[PDB]
Amino acid sequence: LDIETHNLTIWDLDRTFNVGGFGGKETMTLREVLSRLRAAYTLKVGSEYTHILDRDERTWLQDRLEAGMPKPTQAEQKYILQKLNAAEAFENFLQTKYVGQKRFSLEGAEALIPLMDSAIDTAAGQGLDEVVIGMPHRGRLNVLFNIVGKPLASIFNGDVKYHLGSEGQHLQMFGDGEIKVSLTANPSHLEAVNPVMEGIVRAKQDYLDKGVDGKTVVPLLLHGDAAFAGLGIVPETINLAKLRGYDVGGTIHIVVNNQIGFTTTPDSSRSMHYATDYAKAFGCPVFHVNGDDPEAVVWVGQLATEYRRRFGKDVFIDLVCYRLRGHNEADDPSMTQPKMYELITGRETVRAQYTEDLLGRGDLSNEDAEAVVRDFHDQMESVFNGLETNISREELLELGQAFANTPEGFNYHPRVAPVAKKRVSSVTEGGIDWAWGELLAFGSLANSGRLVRLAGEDSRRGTFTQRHAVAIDPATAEEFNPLHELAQSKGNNGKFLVYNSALTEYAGMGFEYGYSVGNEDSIVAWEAQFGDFANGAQTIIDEYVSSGEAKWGQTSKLILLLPHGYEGQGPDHSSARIERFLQLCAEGSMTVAQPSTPANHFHLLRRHALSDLKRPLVIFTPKSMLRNKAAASAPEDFTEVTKFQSVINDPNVADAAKVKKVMLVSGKLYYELAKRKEKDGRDDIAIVRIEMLHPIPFNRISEALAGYPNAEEVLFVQDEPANQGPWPFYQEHLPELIPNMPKMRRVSRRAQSSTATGVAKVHQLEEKQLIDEAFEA
Amino acid sequence: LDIETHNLTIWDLDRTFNVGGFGGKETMTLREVLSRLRAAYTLKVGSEYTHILDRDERTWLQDRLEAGMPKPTQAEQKYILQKLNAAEAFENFLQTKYVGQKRFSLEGAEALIPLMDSAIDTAAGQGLDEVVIGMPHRGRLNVLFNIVGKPLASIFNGDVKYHLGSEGQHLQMFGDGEIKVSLTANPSHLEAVNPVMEGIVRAKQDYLDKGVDGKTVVPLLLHGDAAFAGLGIVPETINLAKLRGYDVGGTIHIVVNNQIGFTTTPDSSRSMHYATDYAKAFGCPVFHVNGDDPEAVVWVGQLATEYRRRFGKDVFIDLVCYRLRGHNEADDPSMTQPKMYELITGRETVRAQYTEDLLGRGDLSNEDAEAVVRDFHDQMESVFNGLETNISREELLELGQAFANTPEGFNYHPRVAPVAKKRVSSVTEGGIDWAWGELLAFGSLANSGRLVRLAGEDSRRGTFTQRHAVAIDPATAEEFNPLHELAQSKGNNGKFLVYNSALTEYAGMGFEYGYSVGNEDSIVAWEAQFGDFANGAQTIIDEYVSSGEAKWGQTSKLILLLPHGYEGQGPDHSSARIERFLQLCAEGSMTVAQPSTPANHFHLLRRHALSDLKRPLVIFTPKSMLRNKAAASAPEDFTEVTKFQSVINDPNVADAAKVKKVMLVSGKLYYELAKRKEKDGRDDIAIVRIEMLHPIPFNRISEALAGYPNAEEVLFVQDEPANQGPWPFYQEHLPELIPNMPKMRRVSRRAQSSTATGVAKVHQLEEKQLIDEAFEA
Ligand SMILES: Cc1ncc(C[n+]2csc(CCOP(=O)(O)OP(=O)(O)O)c2C)c(N)n1
Ligand SMILES: Cc1ncc(C[n+]2csc(CCOP(=O)(O)OP(=O)(O)O)c2C)c(N)n1
Ligand SMILES: [Mg+2]
Ligand SMILES: [Mg+2]
């Protein structure tokens, strides 16, 4: 940036040169060229835009930045001063009338309030419908009073004010526009709101139904500088921006850069030059603005909101400010950073500086000048004053016939063709498999008129090549979605939408929780490749899915589909960790189940979607049992059987008076135990299945055991190790709920620190030993 | 890139222009300029380097890329052909002699083997000590045979071959260099090895002790394209590259870009143009190379290894290849991607293409040509043939006096000065607090001659302003580390190293597990800001810390320090989730403790560091008890008391024959219960503390209860809800280990789905109700 580096000297300043349309001129002097470049790129706004690849969007930014900030009117200037007065008035009320609020102070960063106002007002003039805000603790109550518009009485009267959500309206001072404003709930875990907020926006856009030209709900997301550079959830969520099921038309990002973490400085926080350098990975513009020049801050807010509407991409604003006090209530920040807090202590406020600048440009009259003084006193005085789930024979045949009604000149790939042919025959003959039972449920619900959404890794085809919900023609590469087409022909505007995720668990599951909150009337399901990989979304399970209703009174009906089974494929492909989910359950917080039969899975999904109980559902789904012919279901099981079963008694008992042992079991291990009973001719054993785990169906288990009056012993049989699976939960709780029951006796694998062996011959030997122990006299 | 865009035509091709030293010339024709630019930037190697900010490192890359790939010798050419022959020979043996290996095939990407060889050979010529490799499943057994150098017998004979680690030597064909080569263990969870591998390299560099000019252990890290763009752990780990405690001199990254995930294409995987676009966020160079030109691949390997040694930064290679077969053993990839697998099926191999190119440039003689044919047949034939922990009075006084031996013209900040003065007096008078007990332990061990490392968020000062292990002078900003200086004066080369992390839990804890594996003789500890935030590193707890010894036989002695207590500060600042850690324990896999007294914490840390048992330690550390004066310890407790105590019996019992109730407790709640016993004069109650949780000290608990022979009842008292804390574990296991014990009776908070309330008045009412219930007759 020095003229010496380009072989130019002081002797060239008044010579004329060809500049090729720079500043709308063909010729210019070096003195004039340097003036313009310094006015555009070196004052209170610093821009990064030349890394963008499209020529049209690079030229749009270039023309606006080199034209400069327009000179604001007197009316505009006084409106910026009134917002700064309100911001500072509220900070003073909080610090004086209440205690332990020093942690949550906005002092140093009061220009945030006029920046957020500029963006929301620009959106109202564009004609859009809503703005959804997500943010951390710092400045939250200030945003509730000055941006959402809640009364003071409402703010100051489970969980705290600093974590609950709110709604309000924003009218436009110098226009005729209105817009809704919403604030999202969040935990103390930094950046965990990022994917949840994005999902809420997509659900709201889908409900308005305005097409690709729409995208009329704006996401505004606030970060801190240390958290933005450090935590990996931030760039994981930005990567979903342009994908098919996840696009929301761009996100406006504000990073509040107060040059300190807690007791940590930027040198020990990041290996990037600026905190906002992830923008250069995704091809998006960055604006750096000085937080002590309020006219420049309101311009950057306007320019960012205009860039989002024109190009539909993400935009990043870096607001450079400082932190006046320490993070703790009684803690000295000079203890660790003494040199920085020499510059901070005993400054003038941004309000004071701006008032002095307006009263010294001589624009204002005598009457006008008195008013500016009186406004701050005004703001201060104001603040200190029996449900059946079966379908009809006719409905079932129609669902089957959807896989035959192929569009003109579409053919199926020849490994997919025989799957389609069996779906059409099965609804009369029999032999319905797991995958076809699941799709018959989601299809029936879309016909009634609901929006059904399914998302996860390789979810269109299926991980185990079992689903085939969208088919592709090998010749033409044309897509067909049979059940979506049937739904849109019944005339209740139903939809079946199926999407393939990116390789993420945290961002993926977070996005589907958000969708459930932003449309109460939708049916949403997230699937995992294997249930073993759901530990990479533990923050979302612990802080939102299991605990949200108790904390904030926020309800969800999300379905988690997690594969599970001990089939000899190693420790990272065997367990979805049942024990961990049952540890998190209390007073019916969520429903947990493991069904054995395709028809029972059908009845569970339909009960959840047609009930008034608004809590999540966790289903442990099979892998090998997907293709077992003893598991398949008849059509009368979807048409004559009315309800979902929580306990299934033994089908193969000749005489109940001869039974002496009773085995309790849950999942795929039933079919192995049943095989052995038939081979050995054991008429003294009865095998009983538990389909629902939490809540405990204790009345149905009691009825079952009452039916065998000469039973001496009760065994609990599971595949999982003795410190894993459902045994720990059941040995604690079941004896107190059924007093007359005999003492239970465990039969399982040995307790261990891993999930399962990695040697396949050891797996086969363990399984033999388990079943022999069960039948041993 | 079209000449029309720059207002130039065909009529300018033979006119001469000033080019300013391009191609080492002052003048040149447009025809010559276009030739050179196309030869340098548009053939088999594509470069991204102009985003780099330093002028010297931009010019170094520019000069090498525009000079071009050097013409390789005949000997060099035949050595590249022999490596491709070996690679393809081994793939054929695996596919024919064994089954279910189609998932793990390298067919399509055989140029990986000569790329990795080029880099390792270049490192050996630079004079460096070791190369550490981390990678996923694809190509692993090929790398074990052709790069590490294991025999076939060793490979083909718990867990599988695809997850265990190995060591070997690499000699240099045309030189006199040797270098060690190591391969790291890993789970199926993609990208979880990234932080663990980096930590292993830093531990090995620290042991060699060669200073800043050293950095002589090279990290080589292999990724897949979908995982690299999608999972957030990747950019979280790159952000640690230039930080103080974490820098290893650069990382060479290889992304194998086979243009497909599992059944998912790049369109539905990322929102970036290339998968390697995170490089532009961190200011590092990227080389894209064609995987069907083996001479270009060996050049890029050399250039990347030379760039790391000169500039000490990260470097990224994108190897563009394809995937010949499907990911499953029996699965058709044309089912989903039919158009892509029209181009793939029925191609010539990279080995075949390169042989045809050498035999058609006429360099080779008749004798030389016969040899090239016979080499592939040769490679094929070959493959198919009573420990006391106290310190002395003198050692204790010396540790105290370290906080007085300030360097010349250093003064303490005046809020830190009185802490230092009390540390010097306490070692004679009394009143030693928690923090000073912890540092007395780490200090004593550094004096004996060990390397002690402590890392975490705000760990130098402390989160609760309690530690002060490095002090800063407010006048000069000069640092002092008293205990490091005492260690280096005793002449056993001991060190006390303390570092402030970035705001990360996954990358942070991963790095400290790696350090423990790469130096068995170090004492390492990771601290969390609050124990509630450790759920963001659940992948590392589940897959490495709790399970590594059982899976792979890999041992660690890592210390986790997790703050814990119910003090009325909300649901994300109360519980470290004890219940979850005790669920993961079996057959002494790790030690779990919650000490009540500073001296007992001292004795636990020293027992762990001087034992032969090589397993992790999880300590639940206090918050409010840090400054409680009833908790402080006398000097005789560090000097006359010999061992760590697992159970502590009641100090305040006049007559043991009068006791009728016995309360068991663990942690800070002791001090509340003890206060109430004194106030009410209860000589019928005895309060007994459990300091170690797993393993269960059942012999010591039995001895304690035997001492009170007229005890009618036993209460278990905890602050946590009834489905959380240590009660679930103890109600299952303790009755079977002590048969004669009376039936236990719980006294706790009610079971719930969250951790704790968010209203402070409700917390105080709950605590009163808990203690009243305990003492109720
Ligand atoms: C996931 C997570 N990790 C760590 C913390 C602990 N924590 C609370 S506040 C804080 C500092 C954040 O600093 P920054 O993002 O720079 O913003 P500031 O509060 O200074 O505005 C940290 C690390 C947390 N709340 N959540
Ligand atoms: C954390 C995690 N998430 C998901 C998976 C499931 N998974 C196994 S292989 C695979 C595909 C990875 O594709 P890519 O990284 O492009 O490499 P390729 O195997 O095609 O070489 C996935 C998603 C996993 N193993 N770990
Ligand atoms: Mg900050
Ligand atoms: Mg790939």
Author numbering:
A (entry chain B), B (entry chain A): 407 to 563, 578 to 805, 830 to 1221
Show the paper's wording.
Contrary to most organisms in which three enzymes compose the 2-oxoglutarate dehydrogenase complex (ODH), actinobacteria rely on a two-in-one protein (OdhA) in which both the oxidative decarboxylation and succinyl transferase steps are carried out by the same polypeptide. Here we describe high-resolution cryo-EM and crystallographic snapshots of representative enzymes from Mycobacterium smegmatis and Corynebacterium glutamicum, showing that OdhA is an 800-kDa homohexamer that assembles into a three-blade propeller shape. The obligate trimeric and dimeric states of the acyltransferase and dehydrogenase domains, respectively, are critical for maintaining the overall assembly, where both domains interact via subtle readjustments of their interfaces. Schematic illustration of the reaction steps involved in the oxidative decarboxylation of 2-oxoglutarate with generation of succinyl-CoA and NADH/H+ (ODH reaction), with emphasis on the catalytic steps catalyzed by OdhA. These include the ThDP-dependent decarboxylation of the 2-oxoglutarate substrate followed the reductive acylation of the lipoyl group provided by E2p (both catalyzed by the OdhA E1o domain), and the transfer of the succinyl moiety to the CoASH acceptor (catalyzed by the OdhA E2o domain).
The overall structure is very similar to that of the homologous MsKGD-GarA complex, with OdhI molecules binding, through their FHA domains (traceable for residues Glu40-Ala142), to the OdhA E1o domain with a 1:1 stoichiometry. In contrast to the other single particle EM structures, OdhA adopts here the resting conformation, equivalent to the one observed in the crystal structure of OdhAΔ97 and consistently with structural and kinetic observations on mycobacterial KGD, both indicating that GarA binding stabilized this enzyme conformation. Moreover, no ligand bound to the OdhA acetyl-CoA allosteric site could be detected in this complex, suggesting that bound acetyl-CoA may have been lost because of OdhI binding, further confirming the link between the presence of the activator and the conformational state of the enzyme. Interactions with OdhA involve the tips of both OdhI FHA antiparallel β-sheets: one anchors firmly to the OdhA loop Leu591-Glu598, which connects two antiparallel β-strands, while the tip of the other OdhI β-sheet binds the OdhA α-helices Gln480-Lys503 and Asn786-Asn805 (αE).
